[PDB]
Design a protein around this ligand. Structure first.
Ligand SMILES: O=C(O)CCCC[C@@H]1SC[C@@H]2NC(=O)N[C@@H]21
Ligand SMILES: O=C(O)CCCC[C@@H]1SC[C@@H]2NC(=O)N[C@@H]21
Ligand SMILES: O=C(O)CCCC[C@@H]1SC[C@@H]2NC(=O)N[C@@H]21
Ligand SMILES: O=C(O)CCCC[C@@H]1SC[C@@H]2NC(=O)N[C@@H]21
Lengths: 123, 123, 123, 123
């Protein structure tokens, strides 16, 4: 069963697109992310990601990745697990932190936004 | 100036140790993490990490990484920026999400812990 | 228009129920919360909440509240904004932190879970 | 022992000041917050807060509150526990979410910043 294999094109509720290329045997993967949204006034560009998954009880292993935004000084990390429901539908449940670059140490308090995303496989 | 180079051994306020190996030119890095603490009842083991930094205005670039815990079903992601103060002292300001593996989709609501860490370079 | 008035019975995607009683003129409100889920092994009980909303540009004001769980040592805080869509449907977008009570200061790192909820008005 | 009574003037690492007035018997409290920092370009003003603490094993009970900022469209909620160390020193360990008001539902993804604070009692 290839169900819940991270490898693939995924989309989230914001309309973002994400590709995860094949995992190596260490469980590390790379890919790219096309966000539909930005907190900057910059043109959105496809951006590389780098992550790792835990080794596979009936449960998909947890994974995480870092997106290196190509058009913004920021960095997002996403952490999640895949689930398959009744009718075979796969979903990535993810929580994320978006870190903006700040000029001095004293601005770090405001540098991190948090939220969640739900991804499903693009048909 | 090698000030705020991620490469190195770092420690945080919890007494965790972290090594970041040299960055490649794409800005991706790997390394390992020795946490002083765990939310499981398992023996702590050194664990690989995989991350990426943004390219370097006077400001260090943001970075993120994923720790693949070797003794736990979980995954942590850390996101941060380095700062150098007056007397040349470097600090990584980081926020993180720890994701526990859960049996079903309905338990995802409780799967993510959040917090911050401050790292300084081991002498 | 009473659209997006916090006053009311709301439900979230987890199937939790929440009542917010009338706001006073200072914008503070109280109410109760019936969670469908718990991270403890205790019987769920209806729990008081205490919050405040900002004063009302076309935008609903932000609000927050604290739930004092009656069956758990923990405390949740929720922060959010209400939205009304095209066909008049109201939704509370909320982010939350659940704080478990810990025995010593050194366990605080693991004490806080984070997530989001979406509430709609019970018909 | 009045050790770890929330009632009092507290300060955090950012240099913010906070007053918590006496708790009522239900455990609800009010007070005010003077932040040293803001993410807006507005003049900072003292702001009311409204919270509740859990009832008091050797462990302080968890609490939470909402700050209704008087100079910003936002709302912060803080959740925490008090600790007393060896030499009698009290500390509030807190995690928080700052929610900015957004024009439409589609901007909610970026509306929530997260972080932590440590408060000690003003001498
Ligand atoms: O605005 C930035 O600085 C970079 C774009 C970040 C987009 C964020 S990452 C989390 C959330 N989920 C998405 O699919 N996009 C937004
Ligand atoms: O408990 C687990 O499931 C894995 C160990 C996680 C340790 C966390 S990661 C964030 C925080 N910072 C640390 O240095 N260690 C803890
Ligand atoms: O488990 C506990 O310690 C108390 C119950 C907490 C339920 C949480 S609060 C956030 C999330 N949203 C809900 O409607 N319920 C869970
Ligand atoms: O900027 C705003 O919109 C309101 C001021 C918020 C200040 C935040 S709240 C969390 C953090 N801790 C503080 O003591 N101040 C900042």
């Amino acid at each position: 069963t290839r169900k819940c294999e991270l490898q693939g094109l995924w989309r989230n509720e914001l309309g973002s697109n994400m590709t995860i290329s094949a995992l190596d045997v260490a469980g590390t993967f790379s890919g790219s992310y096309q966000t539909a949204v930005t907190a900057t006034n910059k043109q959105i560009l496809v951006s590389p990601l780098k992550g790792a998954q835990q080794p596979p009880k009936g449960q998909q292993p947890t994974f995480g990745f870092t997106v290196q935004w190509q058009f913004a000084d920021s960095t997002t990390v996403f952490v999640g697990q895949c689930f398959v429901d009744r009718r075979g539908k796969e979903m990535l449940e993810m929580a994320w932190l978006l870190r903006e670059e700040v000029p001095s140490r004293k601005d770090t308090w405001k540098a991190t936004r948090v939220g969640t995303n739900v991804f499903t496989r693009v048909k």
